[PDB]
Amino acid sequence: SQLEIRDLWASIDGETILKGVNLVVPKGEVHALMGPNGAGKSTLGKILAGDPEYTVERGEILLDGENILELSPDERARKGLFLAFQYPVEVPGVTIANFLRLALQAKLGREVGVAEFWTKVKKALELLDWDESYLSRYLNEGFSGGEKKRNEILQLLVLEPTYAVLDETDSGLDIDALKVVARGVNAMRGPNFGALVITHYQRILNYIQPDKVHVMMDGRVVATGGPELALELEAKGYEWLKEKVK
Ligand SMILES: Nc1ncnc2c1ncn2[C@@H]1O[C@H](COP(=O)(O)OP(=O)(O)O)[C@@H](O)[C@H]1O
Numbered sequence: 001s002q003l004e005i006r007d008l009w010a011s012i013d014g015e016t017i018l019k020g021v022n023l024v025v026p027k028g029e030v031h032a033l034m035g036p037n038g039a040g041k042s043t044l045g046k047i048l049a050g051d052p053e054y055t056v057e058r059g060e061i062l063l064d065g066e067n068i069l070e071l072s073p074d075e076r077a078r079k080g081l082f083l084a085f086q087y088p089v090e091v092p093g094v095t096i097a098n099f100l101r102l103a104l105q106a107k108l109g110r111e112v113g114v115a116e117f118w119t120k121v122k123k124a125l126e127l128l129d130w131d132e133s134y135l136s137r138y139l140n141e142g143f144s145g146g147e148k149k150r151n152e153i154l155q156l157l158v159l160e161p162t163y164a165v166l167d168e169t170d171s172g173l174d175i176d177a178l179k180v181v182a183r184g185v186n187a188m189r190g191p192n193f194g195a196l197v198i199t200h201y202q203r204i205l206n207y208i209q210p211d212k213v214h215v216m217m218d219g220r221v222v223a224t225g226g227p228e229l230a231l232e233l234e235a236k237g238y239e240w241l242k243e244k245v246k
């Protein structure tokens with residue numbers, strides 16, 4: 001009934017990056033994970049995804065009670081953790097529709113007929129208020145990050161994961177990009193879904209209201225609170241918080 005990071009310690013090259021991360025996201029809630037940058041938030045994201053370059057020194061990551069650290073990225077997704085399907089940006093002639101079908105079939109482990117595919121796609125489009133013509137565009141036509149986000153949010157809704165970890169730090173203050181992710185996350189809100197939105201700026205949190213905010217510093221969570229914490233952090237800055245936790 002929750003996604004829990006418990007006393008997680010992780011390194012890369014003997015250098016310890018995560019230093020005892022504790023973070024619980026109850027299914028049904030949407031949390032935010034903030035940090036100054038280099039504090040380890042995007043590293044946590046990569047470890048949740050299974051990036052092999054990292055070494056877990058101690059701790060666990062439990063998804064509904066099961067530790068998934070020893071599972072492959074593929075197995076984690078089967079357990080419900082959202083894992084967007086990656087494909088080379090330079091490959092032409094791939095409609096977004098064919099790609100989504102490929103992604104859904106990979107996650108479900110079986111063929112998906114046209115009725116099941118389009119029914120799921122249509123509901124997703126209805127939730128995002130997007131036109132079905134979009135599915136006829138080619139994957140990566142514009143080689144842009146904004147296009148990558150929109151396409152991954154479509155996957156989020158069609159694949160229906162139980163938990164999703166979304167790192168939006170790369171979008172910075174690009175409002176359109178933050179709003180696309182917010183639309184998708186808000187559309188997925190419900191008792192069978194939990195999410196962790198990773199971000200440096202508080203901006204996206206005005207579109208995605210979090211139930212809880214966790215703030216990392218020097219590889220561990222040093223403060224937690226409601227949305228007001230992200231707000232005070234945005235007004236005063238991270239240096240402020242660093243001292244206040246003392
Ligand atoms: N390949 C790497 N080798 C060694 N240390 C690394 C590597 N990648 C990242 N780090 C260390 O991890 C720190 C935190 O990374 P990151 O998770 O991206 O921070 P954040 O997302 O909080 O800004 C970096 O400041 C760096 O010292």
Ligand SMILES: [Mg+2]
Nearest residue numbers: 035037038039
């Ligand atoms: Mg950070």
Ligand SMILES: [Mg+2]
Nearest residue numbers: 037041042169
């Ligand atoms: Mg970051």
